[PDB]
Amino acid sequence: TSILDIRQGPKEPFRDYVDRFYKTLRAEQASQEVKNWMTETLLVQNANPDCKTILKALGPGATLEEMMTACQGV
Amino acid sequence: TSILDIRQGPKEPFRDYVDRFYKTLRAEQASQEVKNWMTETLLVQNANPDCKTILKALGPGATLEEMMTACQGV
Amino acid sequence: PIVQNLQGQMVHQAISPRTLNAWVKVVEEKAFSPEVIPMFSALSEGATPQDLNTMLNTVGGHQAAMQMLKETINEEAAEWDRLHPEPRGSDIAGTTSTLQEQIGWMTHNPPIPVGEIYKRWIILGLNKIVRMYSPTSILDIRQGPKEPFRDYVDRFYKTLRAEQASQEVKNWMTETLLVQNANPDCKTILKALGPGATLEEMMTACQGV
Amino acid sequence: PIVQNLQGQMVHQAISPRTLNAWVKVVEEKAFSPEVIPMFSALSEGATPQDLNTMLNTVGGHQAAMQMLKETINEEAAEWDRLHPEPRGSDIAGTTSTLQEQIGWMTHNPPIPVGEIYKRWIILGLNKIVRMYSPTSILDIRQGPKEPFRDYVDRFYKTLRAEQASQEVKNWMTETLLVQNANPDCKTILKALGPGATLEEMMTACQGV
Amino acid sequence: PIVQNLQGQMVHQAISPRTLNAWVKVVEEKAFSPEVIPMFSALSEGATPQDLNTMLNTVGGHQAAMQMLKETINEEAAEWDRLHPEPRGSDIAGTTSTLQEQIGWMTHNPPIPVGEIYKRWIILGLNKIVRMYSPTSILDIRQGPKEPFRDYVDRFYKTLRAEQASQEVKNWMTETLLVQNANPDCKTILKALGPGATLEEMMTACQGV
Amino acid sequence: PIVQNLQGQMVHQAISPRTLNAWVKVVEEKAFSPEVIPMFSALSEGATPQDLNTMLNTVGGHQAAMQMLKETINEEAAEWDRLHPEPRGSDIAGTTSTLQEQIGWMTHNPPIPVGEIYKRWIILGLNKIVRMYSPTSILDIRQGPKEPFRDYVDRFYKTLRAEQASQEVKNWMTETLLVQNANPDCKTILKALGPGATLEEMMTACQGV
Amino acid sequence: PIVQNLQGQMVHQAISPRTLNAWVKVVEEKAFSPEVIPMFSALSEGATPQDLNTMLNTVGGHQAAMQMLKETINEEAAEWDRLHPEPRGSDIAGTTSTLQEQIGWMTHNPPIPVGEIYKRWIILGLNKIVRMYSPTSILDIRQGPKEPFRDYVDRFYKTLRAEQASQEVKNWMTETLLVQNANPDCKTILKALGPGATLEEMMTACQGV
Amino acid sequence: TSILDIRQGPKEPFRDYVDRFYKTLRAEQASQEVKNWMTETLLVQNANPDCKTILKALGPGATLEEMMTACQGV
Amino acid sequence: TSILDIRQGPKEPFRDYVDRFYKTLRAEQASQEVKNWMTETLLVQNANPDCKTILKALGPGATLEEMMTACQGV
Amino acid sequence: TSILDIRQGPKEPFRDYVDRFYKTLRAEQASQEVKNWMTETLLVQNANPDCKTILKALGPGATLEEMMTACQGV
Amino acid sequence: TSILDIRQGPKEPFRDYVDRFYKTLRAEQASQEVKNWMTETLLVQNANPDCKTILKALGPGATLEEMMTACQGV
Amino acid sequence: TSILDIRQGPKEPFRDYVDRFYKTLRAEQASQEVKNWMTETLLVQNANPDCKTILKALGPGATLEEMMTACQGV
Amino acid sequence: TSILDIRQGPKEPFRDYVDRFYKTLRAEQASQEVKNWMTETLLVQNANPDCKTILKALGPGATLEEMMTACQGV
Amino acid sequence: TSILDIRQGPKEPFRDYVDRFYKTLRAEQASQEVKNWMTETLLVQNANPDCKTILKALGPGATLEEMMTACQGV
Amino acid sequence: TSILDIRQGPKEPFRDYVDRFYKTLRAEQASQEVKNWMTETLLVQNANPDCKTILKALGPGATLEEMMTACQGV
């Protein structure tokens, strides 16, 4: 499936959803400016409501390391 | 109402509290040097306990745009 | 300190052991409560930069505090070397200058008071530390339902003394926040005095309320 | 203070660092309880106006107190310039005069004791502050049902010492209010002594009541 | 105090500011507990009558105490003028004499120790005040059911030290009342020692009882 | 200490009775809490090895502490005699040398500062004692659920100051353990600051949390 | 104390008023807790027998203690007159000798240190008093079920310091009773260390137990 | 009754308490200098808690006419 | 209606009653000395019993700003 | 019985307690200087709480005749 | 009636009984030494048991001012 | 998981806790000088209360082999 | 058993406790100087509370014969 | 009867038994060495169990004054 | 029986089991290196589970004196 379709399941650990997201992003083959937008925006918007709340609290500049570090307890 | 006693409601969106706060800070007769301190300190101090927990993590330099961005849907 | 010898020339007289111990008591036991600045400013009367560095050797060990203090001293020494192109910043901070240079500077005509100047830079760093170690914001200070207004005023001014606020903001806090955070019975009296009230009027009105 | 040099001439000897720290302890820790006036009056023994101004630099920071103090000093300096048309008010307050003028005045024959005079104006301002910071009116002081009469007498006189009352009003308060506000068991003894009783008689009668 | 100058002649050296403050602490904070007399007697070492009057200026303000003190001093000054027809009573009390007369008297051969004599009259007045401010009669001092005998002995002797009793009556109180008012468990041990027991024997027997 | 005589030669001036009493208060009443090292280092200003041995005569009586101290001094005296083949170890420790040798060494050009060196060996032994008497490991220090972060930081740094850890381990403890052992509400704020936070940032963020 | 005059001759300098007051605080407020002996030994640095008698004038008033002290001094003065057939016992106790004799003796070559000797007899009497006023036997000192081993060790050694035991008995008490009276959880650790353990090992093992 | 123990009744009009107070201050044998202090301090101190709350707001300079005017119908 | 008829309703905020009073006073066209008396006297006497109590506690010299500031909580 | 433990009974006439007290003070082996102190201080200290309240009002100079006269029928 | 007959009624304020006593004493016209005895002795003996107790606690030297001052609370 | 929060289970064999601890100490990014302190102090501090009671008796010099040998079957 | 923990039984005759105590003091490996202190201090300290109350009255000089004689049948 | 027969009755005050004992001893007319033994030994052995316990706690050297002083409370 | 057969009974004091063990070891007559192994190893392995736990806590170097001292409470 395309990257737009990848969502976090209601009880899925964030690291597994991130792995699915980036595996799909690698197959999606969009140009790097679009990949920047997708990894900033879709990855947050398609998270669980709790995890999405944690991620939005980081603001827009968050790196993937920070996003995963924040979500370990979810 | 006095700016000192504007407090974010237990379920009030932070943008609504910001609107109440700054609409009242225009009424306050204190000097601009005092209003600067009010914007810096009262806005965080009088936030909702959840939202206040978000805001204090942003540090003392945080802009109002950053504060509002962090507290979306809190 | 500086003392005139029997030859009439000015000479160093060391900051005494039990004065240093009184400063150690202030640093160790009062936990950078704001009276640390009056007590530093008192115990360092007449102190040369060598004496002041001797007093800072007990702030060392409070590694966070001593970091804030050293960086503030270095900042002011740089500001000195910027403003003034005679002692350089490290000489007035007494790290490079000799004791005899410091005493000379302090006793020339006019005096070059490297002691009192460096003591101001230290007091500015102690202010930063006293702010850091403040237990509360001035906004957190409220009068208890049975607390005497005198004791609340003491807590309020002690906290206001531990705050970054400019004198204009401190004036507004004194006029407005002190009333706002009083307990409702006492606050009723303070409101009835109106906005012009001095602290003397506020306290004599609320006495035993 | 003033000290005779080896040349026999009078010279300044600065108020020592640990004396100033003892005054800082009094200002900061005793919250203008009335013993601040005895302790000021003791620590300022022999103080020139320069020494007294050095001691007031720690009342600064208690912005309300220091305001009452400065305005009372300025009031007395104006009263001096009014009564006496030699030191002017700002010279005896040591803001304009030189240290050598102050020591000269204090050591001429007869002495012009600018130190002890200015120290009276400061003690008068400290009295105003001690009244402001009083936690209670003398009327609020009552003996508890199990409180020793000695402890109630101590609280009563401490408050009476913190009050504006003239000596005639203080005499009446001592004779009448002290009895009125005793607890009923103890008050019965005090009433039975009649109106002429001294405090010695009142205390020895109520001892352990 | 008196100090030998570089010329070898005896001269006045004033009772220091922080010694006076230590006496103010004793007067204000220890509420005429009996250690006020040891502490007065210590702080007044070498005091001339001018120094002693300087120390009494802080008992002033305790209007009852200072009345007892002044009247006892006047009584002893009258007794002096009665017994001795050189210093008169007001000269040895230092109200009329000059400082140079007081130092002369204290340093003639033999000395006329107006300081130590007047200091005895002051200690006699302080004794009267310490009795007045005693919280209890010696008869009220009892050992609590769980109180260590050491602490009861301390309370007992502190009160006995605050009492008018002659040394014969104090001896009887020590021998008899101290046993009588012990708690019954401890009292049983003290009774078993019989009447001859010293305090050392009583305390070592009751240790941890 | 060392004082220049009127002949200009350096001579011994004994560590004063009330300075020694201030050290006795530190040894007896503060139970080798870490401020004993600042207070020792202050009270021993200018101390010769004879003065330092006079100060150690009150650590004697704390038989465990004095054993650790003597063995550490002997260890450093042996290390001195090893490194340097002029004072021997027992001379710089002042057990064999004369007072005049110690003052000579301390006042030659360059100085041979047997006082400040031996004072470092004593401070090293006092460090060992302060570690022994530490009530807790740094790992045991946790913030209470209602404890102010300022008070927890004070307890944490006081314990960290009482620990054997090298500066690298102390840095890691400051960065990591201080956050780990905060209470969960406060810990949430500290986690949100990320790993780079200074203590100033941590405390201002958690202020009143 | 003894001070070299400007003429180079040794002369008396009186034990200062505020040193005597510090001894009065020790006698009155610390109730012959064992730190009274370190504090006496510190405050009496350089004391002549006249100075020591001046210090004993505040143990007078503690009639039991002063009796034990006088009789111990008289016992040692008799032992002196027995051993040595120059100062007699009453001269070294300073009751019969002149001040100039005492200073002569203390400053001849070799010195006849009547001060330090009489100070040992006083410390021996203070030891007897400290034993009498001990609140507990060393056998009564037990660790509470939640008491830190550090605090129990402090209580234990403080009591052991207040006991008649020879050093051999104190060594056995340290090795054996300290373990025996620990609480069972802590005692289990101390037993597991075996009999050879030093106090350092015992405390570091039981730290936070 | 002693002036020290004249207290305003829980429902007593302030004018009635003033009449009781000043009628008794004429009986008091104390000097005029003491009576001045009594008029200044006891009258407020012994007022009814509601009325006392009104009176303390008037400050130390307040005349008896002002005090009575403020407390009408309290 | 004439100014004498304007009264505060039992639950009316004081600011609304003041507005009605001064609107009527402007239409009443009495001379300024009478307006001074009316604004001092009728405005208090025609208030609610609670609000009238608060206003009488201010004494006779109170300005309209002070009167309205006092009554905000009623 | 020891003089220190002679106490007036809860209903005992003061004259009966005085008789018990002085009859026992003749037995006490203490010196006359101690007996003087006992007559002055114990007699009041050990009186019945009502009678003791009467006696302490008489002051320290009171004679036994005065003390007995005051306590008739107490 | 004669002075000997005047007694305090069981609930009579002492001042009223004193007034009756001295009005009768003025009519009795006995010589002054007898009046001294009567005013010292009958006036106490004919009081109520409570008031008589209070009066006896004053001892024999009490003036009429002291007697009345003592009995105000009875 | 952070090495600071690895704690021996209430019934966990000490060898299993040692395996968890040292496997995590390899993950910790702290310097070797800090890891030395961790091996010395955390391993004892975080042991099970029974096992911790055994380990503290071994003294500060104890090797891991000695610690494991002492805690067999604890 | 350790001499420190030999204690007289709640009903044990003092002679039986003395036999237990001294039979154990022969086992103790401590020096004679320590055993002297034990005979002087532990024997009293560890006595039964009744018997201990007897023994402490005898003073510090008491011989074992005197101690046993005093405690017969206690 | 002879001295050997004199015993303390189960509720008899010790002073009465002592009086009976010495009255009998005076009539018994035994030589003084025997009287010494009797007054030391029979006088204790023939006391009540409680009083005999108190007396034995005094040891063998007790004088009659001490014995009677000890037994006053029995 | 041979040394291998000697075991501690479920309630047997360790000293009795040690006595049985060494009595058997003396009869077993194995060479000293084997005796060293047996006294280190069998003596522990054949103890009760509790006593065996205490003994293993001592580690391998324990002397017989230490082993018996450790087990006195079992």
Numbering used by the authors:
A (entry chain C), B (entry chain B), H (entry chain B), I (entry chain C), J (entry chain B), K (entry chain C), ...: 148 to 221
C (entry chain A), D (entry chain A), E (entry chain A), F (entry chain A), G (entry chain A): 1 to 85, 98 to 221
Describing publication, verbatim:
It is constructed of a lattice of approximately 200 capsid protein (CA) hexamers incorporating CA pentamers at 12 highly curved vertices. The surface of the conical capsid is dense in protein-binding sites that mediate interactions with host machinery necessary for transport of the capsid through the cytoplasm into the nucleus. Here, we present structures at 2.6 to 3.5 Å resolution of CA hexamers and pentamers within in vitro assembled conical CA-IP6 polyhedra from multiple lattice contexts differing in local curvature and geometry, alone or in the presence of Nup153-, CPSF6-, or Sec24C-derived peptides.
In contrast, in the pentamer, helix 2 forms an interface with helix 1 of the adjacent monomer. Additionally, a new interface forms between helix 1 of adjacent monomers, including a hydrogen bond between T19 and the εN of R18 that may further fix the position of the R18 ring, and a salt bridge between K30 and E29. Within the central pore of the pentamer, we observe two densities, which we interpret as IP6 molecules: one IP6 sits above, and engages with, the R18 ring, while the other is coordinated by the K25 ring in a fashion that is reminiscent of previously reported hexameric crystal structures. In contrast, in our pentamer structure, the CACTD forms an interface with a position markedly lower on the neighboring CANTD. Here, a largely hydrophobic interface forms centered around Y169, L211, and M215 in the CACTD, and A64, M144, and Y145 in the CANTD. R173 in the CACTD, which in the hexamer forms a hydrogen bond with the backbone of hexamer–pentamer switch residues N57 and V59 in the adjacent CANTD, instead interacts with E28 in the pentamer.
